Design a protein around this ligand. Structure first.
Ligand SMILES: *[C@@H]1O[C@H](CO)[C@@H](O[C@@H]2O[C@H](CO)[C@@H](O)[C@H](O)[C@H]2NC(C)=O)[C@H](O)[C@H]1NC(C)=O
Lengths: 48, 48
């Protein structure tokens, strides 16, 4: 974490800095988006 | 001279109370910010 890292979250290729979320997700939510159609937060498939 | 000075002070003192009311006195300066914000949010929303 806290570094510019190429990530691949269940087939989602991207490039960014992975920091802590600090927002309450409901337990049925996998993705997280913004005003545009870009993924802003992904739930981890292993450590949840 | 005292009447002119008193009327000038009464006209200057009513400027702040007129600008603190009617909710659209500074709308010409709010429009140039609300147009740029709308033109930027349109560029954000056209990526979806
Ligand atoms: C993949 O690994 C993670 C991390 O070890 C597993 O998550 C934990 O698994 C243990 C035992 O299976 C549970 O007691 C914990 O509650 C789990 N923690 C979380 C946050 O899920 C995960 O189970 C593993 N995947 C599979 C399919 O077993």
């Amino acid at each position: 974490k806290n570094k510019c890292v190429n990530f691949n979250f269940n087939g989602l290729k991207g490039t960014g800095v992975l920091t802590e979320s600090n927002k309450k997700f409901l337990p049925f939510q996998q993705f997280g988006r913004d005003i545009a159609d870009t993924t802003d937060a992904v739930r981890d498939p292993q450590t949840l | 001279q005292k009447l002119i000075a008193n009327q000038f002070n009464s006209a200057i003192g009513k400027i702040q109370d007129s600008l603190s009311s009617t909710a659209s006195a500074l709308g010409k300066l709010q429009d140039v910010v609300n147009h740029n914000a709308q033109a930027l949010n349109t560029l954000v929303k056209q990526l979806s």
